[PDB]
Every structure is written in C-alpha cells, then in structure tokens.
C-alpha cells in the first residue's frame, strides 16, 4: 500500500506579495521540489522522472507552470470578489494524489485547506464545500465550477495521469525503495517528573524503512510501561525512534532494550543496562548538564 501525495503551500501576504512552494512525497520519500524561486520543477531523486520520456514530462511541467501562475491570480481575484469578507494574510494548502492497491486498483484525492481548516475538495467533476464548512465559500465555488476547461483537465490528472505516473515511479524506484539500513542504538537516562523515579531512554537511529519494533524487556517479559516515541527524521532519509521506560530508582538492573528491524534479518539489537558496553558508552558521553530542562 503506497500513498503518493503532492503538497502545495501558498502564502498570500497582501494584494501584491505572494509565494508558492511545492513538494512531492511517494510513501515517505521526497521525489519532487518546486520552489517559488525557480520556474521549473526539480527532481530530488534520480528516478523522479518516473517512467516518462523527456517530451512526455514537458507537457506536465508546462501545464503546471501555467497553473502556478494562474492559481495565484485566481485567488487574488477571488479575494477582491468578497469585498469585506476574508482579508489578508491568506494561507492555502493543497494535498492531492492517489493511493496504490493490489492490482490495477487505485483511489485519487484533492483536498484544499483555507487558513488551516480543510474546506474544499474536488470530487467527480466539480469542487465542493466539505460537510461542516463556512457557507461564504459557495460564491467562489460557483465561480470556479463554470470553467469546464479546468474541471476537465483536473479529472485527467486524478482519474488517469496520477496512477499512470505512480505505477511508473514504483517500478522505476524499486531499487531505492527496497534498500535496507541497519540501526545503531544507545541507552541513557533522565530524572522522572515523579519524585524518586527515573526515566530510561533507548535511542534508535539510522534505520530504513520506518516499520520498527522497540521494547523494554526483563528477560522474556515485555515491560508494559514501554512508551514508544515518534518518528524523527534524519538528514539522509533514515529515521529515529526513542523508547522510554519509567522505573523506581534501583530497579534499573536486569532490564534490556530489544530492537527488531527488517534490516538485520533475525539478529535483534539487545542492549543491556549496566553491561560493560553500556558503561563504556556512558563514560564516552559525559557533560556539565547546563541546561537540561
């Protein structure tokens, strides 16, 4: 299951000033970048061109070029159309793309958010105000739908061009997509919010892809207070996940951090609290502690 999304952030500051930057993610790998700086889309990977010929891609870049330019001027007008209602600064976000499934099957989307809240979506052959959205949006919606010419080509991109690109991108980037990166791990500790309690931290960094399994163990028994963190991103498109455990001071011994990843095969990373290894690391990373939360 792969989710290909194109992200568009546009900042309207006043009647003159505006900015549009765009990024494109396949699953969770960046493939495309379009800065307001440059008049052309950029590839961030070698295989970002997809399975398309130089001219075949030109029609896209060119159409999109026409779009950026048009999009700005259209909202800039739509603002003028609502004389008192909706004044600057304006923030508009577009998340559009298609999800991938077993077989030829796919499902595309185009979601639009005005000032943070998601308010407009493209569906079938027309834009529509989401259920639970402000009614003033109706007049601008009515104005935009009259354009069969746009509403036509948007169906083209959603119904056809999206999956016919992404079925390409996947078959063209299987090499980078199925790469395996081994995680390094280290232990540490901080005081707990609670008096007399402490917090044990298991750091996991440099692994690819995402799906990983970190747990605090006393032998065969997983510790239920093992709280998984969030996935923090690394520069080189790997990942970072820490897993913390709260302990009664002087119950730190006997515990160990076990890491299960696709990268390693069967050989789990098992770090033992207070092993000659753990001590070697901890002495290798000592400091003054200002300023520590």
């Amino acid at each position: 299951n792969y989710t290909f999304r194109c992200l568009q952030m546009s900042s309207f500051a006043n009647r003159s000033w505006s900015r549009t930057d765009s990024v494109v993610w396949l699953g969770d790998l960046q493939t495309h970048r379009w800065s307001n700086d440059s008049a052309t889309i950029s590839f961030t990977k070698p295989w970002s061109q997809g399975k398309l010929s130089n001219q075949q891609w030109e029609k896209l870049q060119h159409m999109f070029q026409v779009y950026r330019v048009s999009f700005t001027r259209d909202i800039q007008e739509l603002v003028k159309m609502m004389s008192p209602k909706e004044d600057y600064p304006i923030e508009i976000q577009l998340s559009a793309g298609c999800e991938m499934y077993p077989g030829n099957a796919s499902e595309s989307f185009l979601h639009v958010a005005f000032q943070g809240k998601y308010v407009v979506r493209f569906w079938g052959t027309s834009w529509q105000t989401v259920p639970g959205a402000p009614s003033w949006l109706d007049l601008p919606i009515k104005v935009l739908n009259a354009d069969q010419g746009t509403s036509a080509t948007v169906q083209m991109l959603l119904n056809d061009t999206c999956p016919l690109f992404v079925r390409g991108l996947l078959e063209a980037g299987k090499s980078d997509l199925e790469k395996q990166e081994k995680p390094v791990a280290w232990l540490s500790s901080v005081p707990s919010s609670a008096h007399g309690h402490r917090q044990l931290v298991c750091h996991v960094s440099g692994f690819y892809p995402k799906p990983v399994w970190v747990m605090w163990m006393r032998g065969d028994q997983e510790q239920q207070g093992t709280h998984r963190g969030d996935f923090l991103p690394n520069a080189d498109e790997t990942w970072y996940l820490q897993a913390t455990l709260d302990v009664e001071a002087g119950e730190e011994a006997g515990l160990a951090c076990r890491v299960k990843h696709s990268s390693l095969g069967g050989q789990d990373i098992i770090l033992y609290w207070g092993s000659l290894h753990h001590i070697l690391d901890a002495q290798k990373m000592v400091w003054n502690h200002r300023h520590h939360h």
Partner: T-cell receptor, first 106, second 113 residues
C-alpha cells in the same frame, strides 16, 4: 444591451466628469474600457458586483462606483487633456456599450 | 501588445474575398473572439473559437484557430459595402469570471466599390 450616457461630452481641464452606464441584461461583473488609435481597448476600472469596484490596468486619473447591479460610473475628479478618448462600458459572454466621446480641452 | 493584428488597414473590391490575421502570445488561451466595429458604433461579436484546432463559419464570415501556433485568421467570403469597419481580435485567458480580455489594435477594412 448596454445603455451608457452621455453619448458625447466636452469639458475643460479640471472639471468633474461622470460617465453613466446602464444595463438590464443582469451581469455581475462589468467593466470600463477606453479606446485610442493603435492600441486596442484597455481596462481602466472594473466591478464584480453591487457596491464593489477594483482597479484595472490603467486606473490613474479615474475612479469607479457601483450602486446598483444595473449601473456603473467612471469618474474624473480633475480632468486632463490626455483623457481625451472614447469610453466603452462592457458587461459580462462580454457585451459592450455604444461608446462615449469625451474631448477634454486646455 | 499581447495580441498583434495584421494587416494594419486592408482594401478589397466589392464582392471579393479578404483575409485577416491575429497573432497572440497570451497564456492561457481559453478562447479567441472576433469583433466588428462600425465607426461610431460599439463592438458586435462575430464568432467564437474555443478548441486547440478550431474552425467556425457564420454568414460570409468564416474563421479558424490554432491554439498551438497562437494564431487565427478571419475570412470574409465576397465582401459587401456594409462591411467597411474595424475588426478587433480579442483573447480570453480564462473561461470563468476571474479572467481578463486582451484586445488587438484591430484591422481597418475598406471595401472599394
């Protein structure tokens, strides 16, 4: 169609000049243009609906006012010689007025 | 200057064919419309061109559009005296409300009897 008036006027540098524009065709947005030899029409001011106006390509020296949906007006507070043109009031797919000949003199 | 017309002025003989050219550089090109302006009078629509390769006819008027060469021609088939007028070519960048029209300087057509 579009019923603009006066169909013809002359005024001196500095006089107040207003150009009425009427239409029963029922169009939301409507426009003020001006024609000069070897140029083709140029947008001055333009409206989207009642009680609302916006600046076009060449808005300097002029103003606009929308009271009704049916009416429109292009306003010269201080007139100038260089504002000697013909004035067309469009309505919109876009249907145009018969034109107004304004010679502004020294 | 977005939309240039050739020739400047043109002269044809009563009841003979005449060709008119419009050559834009407007993006986007939703549509191109041709207008006939009698002297003193306003602008009357003649016909509208929409598709990438389009071709229409109306009375003796018959025009064709190539959106990929951003170029149009307007033909009059056997010109009348009632035809001496200026022929303005306009291009519309959007097919909605939020679009503006680009006007040519027009061609002056003179039909000699």
């Amino acid at each position: 169609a579009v019923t603009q008036s006066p169909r013809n006027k002359v005024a001196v540098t500095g006089g107040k000049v207003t150009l009425s524009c009427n239409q029963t065709n029922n169009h939301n947005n409507m426009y003020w243009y001006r024609q000069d030899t070897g140029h083709g029409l140029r947008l001055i001011h333009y409206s989207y609906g009642a009680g609302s106006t916006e600046k076009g390509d060449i808005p300097d020296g002029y103003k606009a006012s929308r009271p009704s949906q049916e009416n429109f007006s292009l306003i010269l507070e201080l007139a100038t010689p260089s504002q000697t043109s013909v004035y067309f009031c469009a309505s919109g797919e876009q249907f145009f007025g018969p034109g107004t000949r304004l010679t502004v003199l020294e | 200057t977005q939309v240039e017309q050739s020739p400047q002025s043109l002269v044809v003989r009563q009841g003979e064919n005449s060709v008119l050219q419009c050559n834009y550089s407007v993006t986007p090109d939703n549509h191109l419309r041709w207008f006939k302006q009698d002297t003193g009078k306003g602008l009357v629509s003649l016909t509208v061109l929409v598709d990438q390769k389009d071709k229409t006819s109306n009375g003796r008027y018959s025009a064709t559009l190539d959106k990929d060469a951003k170029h149009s021609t307007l033909h009059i088939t056997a010109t009348l005296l009632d035809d001496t007028a200026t022929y303005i070519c306009v291009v519309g960048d959007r097919g909605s409300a939020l679009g503006r029209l680009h006007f040519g300087a027009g061609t002056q057509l003179i039909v000699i009897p």
